[PDB]
Write a protein that binds this ligand. Structure first.
Ligand SMILES: N=C(N)c1ccc(O[C@@H]2CO[C@H]3[C@@H]2OC[C@@H]3Oc2cccc(C(=N)N)c2)cc1
Ligand SMILES: [Ca+2]
Length: 223
């Protein structure tokens, strides 16, 4: 997250870190047994880490739980990142508490201008490299589809939306992928892609979760 702030320990209790020996992607807890992330974060051997703030220090509220299965969206395209969403099942149910909490799925899509909360442990530098060890947060609005499409001609589908600032300075970044975009208490987006980070006229692009609520609900009920 570039241009954001330190969230505060466990203030974003649905935020999970995906670990395979190291943090590599964000995710969102959506009930005690399931995580939503981005399909481009797929790999085998995932451990989901819940209740994290400093991902390099055991601070006493963590739950580390291995994935028992991952399900990449049936139409994910790795070239275009269309349908960039995946589900991960926990080998055992998480213990839900004030620091380990699920986030609600949308009932409808959000509209342009809505303010969202984006968070993660990704790079905080627009040029060069600095990874934070504590969770970072950013408030940013959903941009109009025309502004989105204009910045990225031919690359935006109906399953994507842009959020951020066209002026630059504030954006998600490498290492934030898979994490949440929450607007009005609902998971509306997944950190998916962008051009650099926090660059002018290149906002972040997010998976539009509201288009997948039926697939999510049906898939978790059948797995
Ligand atoms: N459909 C496409 N045209 C498109 C499809 C895929 C793609 O991937 C390249 C390689 O990975 C890069 C990059 O994208 C993912 C990542 O950079 C990020 C990751 C997370 C957030 C941000 C951000 N600035 N908000 C950037 C790139 C483009
Ligand atoms: Ca920790």
């Amino acid at each position: 997250i570039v241009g954001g702030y330190t969230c505060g320990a466990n203030t974003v209790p649905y935020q999970v870190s995906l670990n395979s020996g190291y943090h590599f992607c964000g995710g969102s807890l959506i009930n005690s047994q399931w995580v939503v992330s981005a399909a481009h974060c797929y790999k085998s051997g995932i451990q989901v880490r819940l209740g994290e703030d400093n991902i390099n220090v055991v601070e006493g509220n963590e739950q580390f739980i291995s994935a028992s299965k991952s399900i990449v969206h049936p139409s994910y395209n790795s070239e275009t990142y269309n349908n960039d969403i995946m589900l991960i099942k926990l080998k055992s149910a998480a213990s839900l508490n004030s620091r380990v909490a699920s986030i609600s799925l949308p009932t409808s899509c959000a509209s342009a201008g809505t303010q969202c909360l984006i968070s993660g442990w990704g790079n905080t530098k627009s040029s060069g490299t600095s990874y934070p060890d504590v969770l970072k947060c950013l408030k940013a609005p959903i941009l109009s589809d025309s502004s989105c499409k204009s910045a990225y001609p031919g690359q935006i589908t109906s399953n994507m939306f842009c959020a951020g600032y066209l002026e630059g300075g504030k954006d998600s970044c490498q290492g934030d992928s898979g994490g949440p975009v929450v607007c009005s208490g609902k998971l509306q987006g997944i950190v998916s892609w962008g051009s650099g980070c926090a660059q002018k006229n290149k906002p972040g692009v997010y998976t539009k979760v509201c288009n997948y609520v039926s697939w999510i609900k049906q898939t978790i009920a059948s797995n």
